[PDB]
Paper text:
The most abundant virulence factor secreted by Hc yeast cells is Calcium Binding Protein 1 ([name]), which is absolutely required for macrophage lysis. The mature secreted form of [name] is 78 amino acids in length, has no known domains, and, prior to this work, had only one known homolog in the closely related fungus Paracoccidioides. For both Pb03 and [name] [name], the three disulfide bonds present in each monomer orient the alpha helices so that the aromatic residues (Phe12, Phe19, Trp30) are packed in the interior of the protein, creating the hydrophobic core.
Crystals of Hc [name] and Pb03 [name] homologs formed after a week and diffracted to 1.6 Å. The asymmetric unit for the Pb03 [name] crystal contained a single dimer, whereas the asymmetric unit for the [name] crystal contained a dimer of dimers. An alignment of the two dimers of [name] [name] structure gave a root mean squared deviation (RMSD) value of 0.755 Å, indicating the structure remains largely unchanged amongst the dimers.
Author numbering:
A (entry chain B): 2 to 78
B (entry chain A): 3 to 78
The structure:
């Protein structure tokens, strides 16, 4: 089988790349998260950390039907 | 789109991992409990019975090690 360890490494690398690029951008995570139309555990956790947890921000954003909100400019698109 | 492309690759890594986990005999709830990690991602992932793959991965990334038998097929 394809290595699940490698796939986990690639997940961690994708989070790192996003974290490096997102830190350099004009992202307001609490505003972005609140703008999302997302009812999910990931969003409860992400909003609960005031957007400070980038992995939870990403998991939350993936559960929303809308990602291209004005408040999420600089964060997700 | 700098962050937009990076978010797309994040989603691809999660989607690939999701399909790969089903084929690898992974017991996510057992794996999560074996990590003994009480980070926010882990509490949320455990409450979701391991069904939320993005939170499973975020939880695993907060653990000190993935070296448990319950995480064979999930993380190694």
């Amino acid at each position: 089988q394809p290595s699940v360890g490698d796939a986990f490494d690639k997940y961690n690398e994708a989070v790192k790349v996003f974290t490096q690029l997102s830190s350099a951008a004009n992202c307001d995570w609490p505003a972005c998260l609140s703008s999302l139309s997302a009812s999910s555990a990931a969003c409860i956790a992400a909003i609960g950390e005031l957007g400070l947890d980038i992995p939870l921000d990403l998991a939350c954003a993936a559960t929303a039907t809308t990602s291209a909100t004005q408040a999420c400019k600089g964060c997700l698109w």
